[PDB]
Amino acid sequence: AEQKTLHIYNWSDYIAPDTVANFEKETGIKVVYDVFDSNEVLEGKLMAGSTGFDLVVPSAYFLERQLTAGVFQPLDKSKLPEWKNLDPELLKLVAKHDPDNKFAMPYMWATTGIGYNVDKVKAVLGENAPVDSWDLILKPENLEKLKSCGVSFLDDPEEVFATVLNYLGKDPNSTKADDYTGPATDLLLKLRPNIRYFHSSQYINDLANGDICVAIGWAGDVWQASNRAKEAKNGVNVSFSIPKEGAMAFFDVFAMPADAKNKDEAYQFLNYLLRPDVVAHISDHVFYANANKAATPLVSAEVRENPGIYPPADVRAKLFTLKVQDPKIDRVRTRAWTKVKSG
Ligand SMILES: N=C(N)NCCCCN
Ligand SMILES: [Ca+2]
């Protein structure tokens, strides 16, 4: 008799405009849907406990770090009859963080690559600018030429150091402290005078408006920037590269806090997300690949056929995933990132 409620916490710009409304119309459940613009906000609230959320959207990486902390509770697959729709390849990658896929429902995934302005890069570096390579943004001679049109990096040491280590021919997940303080920091300090800022969201609208011409960014965010520029009929042409040397893949997942009050409603929402049209519609709006293999044909051609959103087998084989480091490396990385950004 009483109203059924559900509290969700997700990234901004990571659902379709009508997803929640459609769910409410179909199920009668009241949804309170809150958003963050950085996962540091989510992670800080989960670690503090008693969030009031029934569903949250962490990284598979963070989820691994909190598996022993009891932040999350295992998902009851009997309430998720469309679980069979999830792509088995992605389930296996997520399971590196969540054995036997016990706690997390893969949601969307993408890569950390290069977002850029096509016209500005070709004006500055020529028609043969190496947009297919990390050389575009990790060679100082190129960044010096791009300095004035604006360069940004993510403010994310784990991802940036891993990208740098892969580029140098080191283990992207090296456990050697000297790899970070030595060769990775050396390259970063060479590049640093040419970097306008380190920020993990300002780069989206700056790419869309023409204010930055190259950025390390998350694929779907860059594709959103490209679409925003198109809708603004502003002439700006943004693209994204998964470079030929490889790149980091990441997997955002739905998970259920251990103190969730509205569990039946949360399962209804997850099984709704597993219906192929629901997550295909989300992908159509947010320009991220969903993790549902049944959904892929339903995604619009512009999105499904974009190999920087849905990469093919050869590109997938070049992606690496982040591993959890020992605390001693975590601290070396954080210390070194502060040095890089300082100067
Ligand atoms: N960095 C992640 N793990 N996800 C980024 C998602 C952003 C959706 N607007
Ligand atoms: Ca991840």
Numbering used by the authors: 27 to 369
Article sentences:
Here, we present a fluorescence-based, genetically encoded AGM biosensor, consisting of an AGM binding-domain derived from the putrescine periplasmic binding-protein (PBP) PotF from *E. coli* fused to a super-folder circularly permuted GFP (sfcpGFP). In the sensor the large conformational change of the PBP upon ligand binding is transmitted to the fluorescent protein by altering the chromophore environment and thus triggering a change in signal. We chose PotF due to its promiscuous binding of biogenic amines characterized in prior studies. Previously, we identified AGM as a natural ligand (K_D_ = 0.22 µM) for the periplasmic binding-protein PotF.
We confirmed the effect of these mutations on AGM specificity by measuring binding affinities with ITC for the PotF receptor module without the fluorescence protein: PotF-S87Y-A182D displayed an affinity of 0.3 µM for AGM and no apparent K_D_ for the other tested ligands PUT, SPD, and CDV ([Fig figs3]). To examine and understand the binding of AGM further, we solved the crystal structure of PotF-S87Y-A182D in complex with AGM and compared it to the wild-type PotF structure. Interestingly, the two lobes of PotF are slightly more open in the S87Y-A182D construct ([Fig fig2]). We analyzed the relative orientation of the lobes in this structure and found 10.9° wider opening and 7.1° wider twisting angles compared to wild type like closure. Still, most AGM interacting residues in the binding pocket do not differ ([Fig fig1] & [Fig fig2]). Since the lobes are slightly further apart, distances between interacting residues and important binding pocket water molecules can change. These distances are compensated by the bulkier ligand AGM but are most probably detrimental for high affinity binding of slim ligands like PUT and SPD. The main structural changes occur in the distal site of the pocket (S87Y & A182D, [Fig fig1] & [Fig fig2]) where the guanidino group of AGM is located. It appears that this larger and bulkier group withstands the mutational changes and maintains high affinity while the smaller primary amine groups of other ligands lose most of their affinity.
